[PDB]
Each structure stands twice: as C-alpha cells, then as structure tokens.
C-alpha cells in the first residue's frame, strides 16, 4: 500500500498474510474458519504445498504470538484466465480450522450481483509495497480509496485516491476491499505502475461470486 497508514493492531481480523519460506507473498481474506479467499494469481505458479496462512498478524517482523498458522489442503478456482486476469479469485481450503476470536474473525461478504457505483468510500489493506524502493510492509496498512467506473471494465470493481498519488502495490494482490463493512474486492492488478494517479486499481468483484463461494464453504 503506497501512502496509507499504520492499521491499528488487529483492526481487520479477517486479514490474512500468505508467506512461502517466511516472506509475505500476497494477502486474503479469512471467509470460515477453514476457508480463506485470494487472487488465483497469487498461487498459479506457486508450489501450494509450501504455502503458509498466516491469520492473527500484524507486524510481520515481530513473533506475534496472536498468529495461527495453516496450510492449504485443497484450492477452488472459478475460471481464472491469467491472460485476461478475469475471474482473479481462488478459495484455499486449510488444513484446519481457526480458533476465533477477537484477533481471528470471519469476514462479512455482499450479496451476490450487488454492483457498486461511482463514489462509494472503501478501505485497501495490506502487507505489499510501500512505493518506490521502500519494499514490503511490516506493519498491515490501510488506505482511503473511492469507486471508480472510468477506466475500469465491468468485471472488475476498480478505485482511484483523489488528488494524491496513492493506492495498492506488489504484495497487495489478494488483500480485500472493504465496502461499508463488506468484502468487496480482491485486489488483482494496477496500470501504470503502483499509485500512479491515473489508473485505478482494479479488484476481483466479489460480489460476482459470492453463490460459488458458499457453495464451497458449505
Ligand atoms: C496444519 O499445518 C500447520 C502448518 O504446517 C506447516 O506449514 C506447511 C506449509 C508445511 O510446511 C508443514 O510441514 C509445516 O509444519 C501445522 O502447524 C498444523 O499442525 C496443521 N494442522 C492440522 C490440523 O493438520
């Protein structure tokens, strides 16, 4: 997340960190207790097994004895085109079940074809770049972001930051969208490089999806 802000601890207890050898990879959303939602691009070229699900975190670089850590048992796709990056969502199934509690909830979804217009006010997250040269977070941060239609397609919910250059980055991709306390996007792809002011970031429209989501997490 380019020009956010420090989340306060725990703010997001659905918030996920996926890590392969201990290093942060992409972000997703905690959707019951043995379930997590992604970007399909996160994992499609990545060795599953050696995927870790990191819920409970907030400062990658301290122990943080709030974590619990899962492994992925089995992965959902919905017709992932990586050419394209349509339909950018994957569910991961986990080896187990989250204890929940104040630091570990499940997230709250839309219904299913709700379409969000032009200006309404969500919230980015995530553990991905901070901008040019300053690498990945350590602390989960957050950001103000405003629907946009222009310059985006139909099949994406996408977001633009207003008179500043700020927005989603490396890192970010599979981290959610909060929209009036709903899971609306997944963050997928930006243009122009990260917070360039010009194009917005573009998400996976969860609200697209959410009857194959629950027909998978039963
Ligand atoms: C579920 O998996 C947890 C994490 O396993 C660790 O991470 C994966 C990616 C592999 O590297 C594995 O060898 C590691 O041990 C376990 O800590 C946990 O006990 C498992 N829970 C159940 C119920 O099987």
Not at 131 to 138: K, P, Y
């Given at each position: 997340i380019v020009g956010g802000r420090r989340a306060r601890?725990?703010?997001?207890?659905?918030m996920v960190s996926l890590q392969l050898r201990g290093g942060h990879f992409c972000g997703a959303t905690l959707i019951a207790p043995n379930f997590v939602m992604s970007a399909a691009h996160c994992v499609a070229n990545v060795n599953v097994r050696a995927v870790r699900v990191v819920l409970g975190?907030?400062?990658?670089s301290r122990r943080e004895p709030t974590r619990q850590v899962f492994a992925v048992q089995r992965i959902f796709e919905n017709?992932?085109?990586?050419?394209?990056?349509?339909?950018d969502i994957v569910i991961l199934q986990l080896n187990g079940s989250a204890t929940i509690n104040a630091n570990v909830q499940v997230a709250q979804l839309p219904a299913q074809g709700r379409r969000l217009g032009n200006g309404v006010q969500c919230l980015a997250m995530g553990w991905?770049?901070?901008?040019?040269?300053?690498?990945?977070?350590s602390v989960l941060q957050e950001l103000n972001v405003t629907v946009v239609?222009?310059?985006?397609?139909?099949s994406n919910v996408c977001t633009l930051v207003r008179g500043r250059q700020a927005g989603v980055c490396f890192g970010d991709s599979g981290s959610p969208l909060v929209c009036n306390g709903l899971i609306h996007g997944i963050a997928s792809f930006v243009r122009g490089?990260?917070?360039?002011?010009?194009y917005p970031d573009a998400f996976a429209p969860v609200a697209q999806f959410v009857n194959w989501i629950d027909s998978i997490i039963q």
């Amino acid at each position: 997340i380019v020009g956010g802000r420090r989340a306060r601890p725990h703010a997001w207890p659905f918030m996920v960190s996926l890590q392969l050898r201990g290093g942060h990879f992409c972000g997703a959303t905690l959707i019951a207790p043995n379930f997590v939602m992604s970007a399909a691009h996160c994992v499609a070229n990545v060795n599953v097994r050696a995927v870790r699900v990191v819920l409970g975190a907030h400062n990658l670089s301290r122990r943080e004895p709030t974590r619990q850590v899962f492994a992925v048992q089995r992965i959902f796709e919905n017709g992932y085109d990586p050419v394209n990056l349509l339909n950018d969502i994957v569910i991961l199934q986990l080896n187990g079940s989250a204890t929940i509690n104040a630091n570990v909830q499940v997230a709250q979804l839309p219904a299913q074809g709700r379409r969000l217009g032009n200006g309404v006010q969500c919230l980015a997250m995530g553990w991905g770049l901070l901008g040019r040269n300053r690498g990945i977070a350590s602390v989960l941060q957050e950001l103000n972001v405003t629907v946009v239609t222009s310059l985006c397609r139909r099949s994406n919910v996408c977001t633009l930051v207003r008179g500043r250059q700020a927005g989603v980055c490396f890192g970010d991709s599979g981290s959610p969208l909060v929209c009036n306390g709903l899971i609306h996007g997944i963050a997928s792809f930006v243009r122009g490089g990260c917070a360039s002011g010009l194009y917005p970031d573009a998400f996976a429209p969860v609200a697209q999806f959410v009857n194959w989501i629950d027909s998978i997490i039963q």
